[PDB]
Amino acid sequence: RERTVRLQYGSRVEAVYVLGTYLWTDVYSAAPAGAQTFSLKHSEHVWVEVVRDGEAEEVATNGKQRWLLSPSTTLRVTMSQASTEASSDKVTVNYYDEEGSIPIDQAGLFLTAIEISLDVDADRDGVVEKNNPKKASWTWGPEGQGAILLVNCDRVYSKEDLKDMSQMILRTKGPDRLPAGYEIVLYISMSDSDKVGVFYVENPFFGQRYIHILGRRKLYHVVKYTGGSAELLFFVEGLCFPDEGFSGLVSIHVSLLEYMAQDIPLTPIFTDTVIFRIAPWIMTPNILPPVSVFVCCMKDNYLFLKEVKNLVEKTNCELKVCFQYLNRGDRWIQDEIAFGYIEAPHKGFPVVLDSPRDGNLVKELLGPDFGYVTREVTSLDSFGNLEVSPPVTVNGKTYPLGRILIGSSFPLSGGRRMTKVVRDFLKAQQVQAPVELYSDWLTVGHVDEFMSFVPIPGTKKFLLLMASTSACYKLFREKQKDGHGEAIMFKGLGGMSSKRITINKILSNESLVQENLYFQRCLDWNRDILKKELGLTEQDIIDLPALFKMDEDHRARAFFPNMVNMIVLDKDLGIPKPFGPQVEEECCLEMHVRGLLEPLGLECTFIDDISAYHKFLGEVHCGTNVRRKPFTFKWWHMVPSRR
């Protein structure tokens, strides 16, 4: 970087010189009008070239050389090392008249050279490197660079409270003090002031207290210069995730400012900039290793608790049991809480999004391990309506973190849709490239009512599981042909007994057959979008028998529990107990599902969440959610499409 400095008449101009720049210097303007030629001297650590019309020549510390005075003859002045107290760094120009050799005047430059660098971990290893040449930019991918910031998800300071934030270090080198008239100022834009905050210890002699120096209402902070080789440590937090109007990028600047006079702005002499990207929220698909299983239910649903405990005991997972709250639905751990994570090179942790039904009065429950983000509406707004696929490749395009799936209605339908605020949030994270499905044919309207994903044991592959009414009707027709038409469903649910629902009764209900043909069309429409957007073929899909009843809005609710919404712990699947028709004293739905899944090495455990209620009307009163290990793939290594 070249900087312009002009000599002053009969004077020694004084300037700070910042390493990494050089000075092009006008000697002509300072010359007496009657002057003809000039000569120069300079100190050992100042390098001086005379540049005449683009051509440069190095000049000795004390030579006698003379040059003609011209506007087109200038100096180039360079220094490679910072000044100390022992330094006298200078360049002096002597001016001569017609009959020369005794100088008629002189003008000079007294220089104080300093190093100033605002440093961050741009190469993404967790350490703050010295002056990364790419630190002012942010690029995606394996070879990409620039620093990463985490949102503070827990919400005078202690250093321990700042332990998870990003480090930024102002590194300087110079003599005891800067010359009179200079200050160093750290600053941000008004726009970024609600995106970021910065902390440091303003007064280290009096203690370790970290104070917030940049953020809301504070756009700049003057930092004291200390001599020698010094480092000032700053901690930086993100205040919010990327969103519709915010890309995720923020900048922080330091400038060396020169005082000119009263009522005149200070001149930025040198400015150094770093950029951060705020890490996106990332959802964990069912193929990732489970860590903890969270369940909610009424205290007295004993079979559910006992059977979930037994399932989790087959695994290395921990079980966390939660009960119902006044401000939350009966499924809240599934519907109101979404499990995800954030990661930077220096740290990462799980982050839960919370959208309580009635608002807040759970952070206590989840524990200190989690970041916790709460929102400031239809049933499609539930996190039961959010899923994420395993990593996929679609027509050559890789989605290494998978793709988020959101239930919606058809564009021209006038139907329900997840709120724009949430849709825009998910889109803005960019790394999960969301896809909208069709859930609005369901009364509740959640994608988790019709689909899930499971890993295939012993492989890196996975299956899409789809609810299928066609599979159920085929199974029931087969059992009827076999002489089982009188087989009864809902055995043991006393509140269903008077209905006497059998295979015969279901198959002869004409309107119900027609409703379920239509629901199968809805399922198939989704099947096609999923195959297209996830790059799946029919060999990647298993159909589980399902059956629905229609409401007045022509929307579906489960006739018997939806088996597709299951607890996935690697090879072990907790599957809602269907209460299907009994054939030879086994549920034909359970037997059919085992016959589909078990050959693939999946182990099925049926979990009864409805017996405590004595009947099933389409509503489930329990919920589960799983904290999983993050992807091994670093999100910053992705190269998302541009917007």
Residues noted as catalytic: 622
Shortest CB 306 distance to a copy of itself, Å: 35
Enter the tokens of residue 95. Answer: 């001016």
Contact between 367 and a copy of itself (CB under 8 A)? no
The item of a copy of itself, Ca ion, none sharing an interface with residue 123, based on CB under 5 to 8 Å by kind, is Ca ion
Using left for φ > 0, alpha for ψ between -120 and 50, and beta otherwise, residue 279 falls in beta
The item of a copy of itself, Ca ion, none sharing an interface with residue 121, based on CB under 5 to 8 Å by kind, is Ca ion
Question: Segment 116-175, which members bind Ca ion (CB under 5 A)?
Answer: 121, 123, 125, 127, 129
Nearer to a copy of itself, 360 or 398 (CB): 398
| DSSP annotation of 390 | P
Name the one range near Ca ion by CB under 5 A: 113-121, 150-158, 501-509, 622-630: 113-121
Contact between 99 and a copy of itself (CB under 8 A)? no
Q: Cα(580)–Cα(503) distance, rounded to whole angstroms?
A: 9
Nearer to Ca ion, 125 or 154 (CB): 125
Shortest CB 513 distance to a copy of itself, Å: 9
Number of residues interacting with a copy of itself: please give it, by CB under 8 A. Answer: 67
Contact between 4 and a copy of itself (CB under 8 A)? yes
Contact between 473 and a copy of itself (CB under 8 A)? yes
Among residues 136, 185, 303, 321, the one that binds a copy of itself under rule CB under 8 A: 185
Please check whether residue 7 is in contact with residue 37, taking contact to mean a CB–CB distance below 8 angstroms. Answer: no
Contact between 49 and Ca ion (CB under 5 A)? no
Question: Segment 241-300, which members bind a copy of itself (CB under 8 A)?
Answer: 245, 247, 253, 255, 257, 260-261, 263-268
Measure Cα distances from 205 to 176, 201, 209, 211, 223 in Å: 18, 10, 10, 14, 15
Q: For residue 60, with 0-12 CB atoms within 10 Å meaning exposed, 13-18 middle and 19 or more buried, which class applies?
A: exposed
Q: Cα(77)–Cα(23) distance, rounded to whole angstroms?
A: 5
Which regions of 279-403 does DSSP assign to beta strands (E)? 282-283, 290-296, 318-322, 337-343, 348-354, 371-374, 386-388, 392-394, 397-399
Contact between 98 and a copy of itself (CB under 8 A)? no
Contact between 22 and a copy of itself (CB under 8 A)? no
Whole-number CA gyration radius for the chain? 35
Question: Segment 564-623, which members bind a copy of itself (CB under 8 A)?
Answer: none
Write the interaction track for a copy of itself spanning residues 205-244; mark x where CB under 8 A is met and - where it is not.
--------------xx------------------------
In the chain, residues preceding a discontinuity (C to N beyond 2.5 A) are 155, 361, 376
Nearer to Ca ion, 135 or 446 (CB): 135
Question: Segment 371-410, which members bind a copy of itself (CB under 8 A)?
Answer: 409-410
Q: Which of 107, 142, 182 is nearest to 638 (CA)?
A: 142
Shortest CB 429 distance to Ca ion, Å: 24
Please state, as a whole number, how many other Cβ atoms lie within 10 Å of the Cβ of residue 79: 22
Question: Segment 466-525, which members bind Ca ion (CB under 5 A)?
Answer: none
Question: Segment 475-534, which members bind a copy of itself (CB under 8 A)?
Answer: 477-478, 480-481, 517-518, 520-521, 524-525, 527-528, 531-532
DSSP helix/strand/coil, 473: helix
Q: Going by C-beta distance under 8 Å and a sequence separation of 6 or more, which residues neighbour residue 526? A: 437, 438, 450, 451, 466
Nearer to Ca ion, 123 or 161 (CB): 123
Residue with tokens 């299956």: 463
Please check whether residue 549 is in contact with residue 618, taking contact to mean a CB–CB distance below 8 angstroms. Answer: yes
Contact between 187 and a copy of itself (CB under 8 A)? yes
Residue with tokens 């504070």: 218
Shortest CB 522 distance to a copy of itself, Å: 8
Which regions of 323-419 does DSSP assign to beta strands (E)? 337-343, 348-354, 371-374, 386-388, 392-394, 397-399, 404-408
Among residues 252, 283, 471, 547, the one that binds a copy of itself under rule CB under 8 A: 471
Shortest CB 122 distance to Ca ion, Å: 7
Please state, as a whole number, how many other Cβ atoms lie within 10 Å of the Cβ of residue 63: 11
Among residues 142, 207, 368, 411, the one that binds a copy of itself under rule CB under 8 A: 411
Contact between 54 and a copy of itself (CB under 8 A)? yes
Shortest CB 560 distance to a copy of itself, Å: 19
Which regions of 140-259 does DSSP assign to beta strands (E)? 147-149, 166-174, 182-187, 196-200, 211-214, 220-223, 228-238, 249-258
Q: Cα(48)–Cα(77) distance, rounded to whole angstroms?
A: 5
Residue with tokens 């080789």: 229
Please check whether residue 408 is in contact with residue 438, taking contact to mean a CB–CB distance below 8 angstroms. Answer: yes
Nearer to a copy of itself, 12 or 363 (CB): 12
Shortest CB 173 distance to a copy of itself, Å: 23
The item of a copy of itself, Ca ion, none sharing an interface with residue 162, based on CB under 5 to 8 Å by kind, is none
Shortest CB 272 distance to Ca ion, Å: 17
Shortest CB 634 distance to Ca ion, Å: 14
Among residues 459, 498, 511, 537, the one that binds a copy of itself under rule CB under 8 A: 537
Nearer to Ca ion, 346 or 628 (CB): 346
Residue type, 229: S
Shortest CB 602 distance to a copy of itself, Å: 18
- Write out the DSSP string of 417-452: ---HHHHHHHHHH-TT--EEEE-TTBSS--GGGTEE
* Chain residues in the site for a copy of itself (CB under 8 A): 1-4, 6, 8, 24, 26, 28-29, 33-34, 51, 53-54, 71, 74, 185, 187, 189, 219-220, 245, 247, 253, 255, 257, 260-261, 263-268, 409-415, 470-471, 473-474, 477-478, 480-481, 517-518, 520-521, 524-525, 527-528, 531-532, 537-539, 543, 554, 642-643
Per CB under 5 A, residues contacting Ca ion are: 121, 123, 125, 127, 129
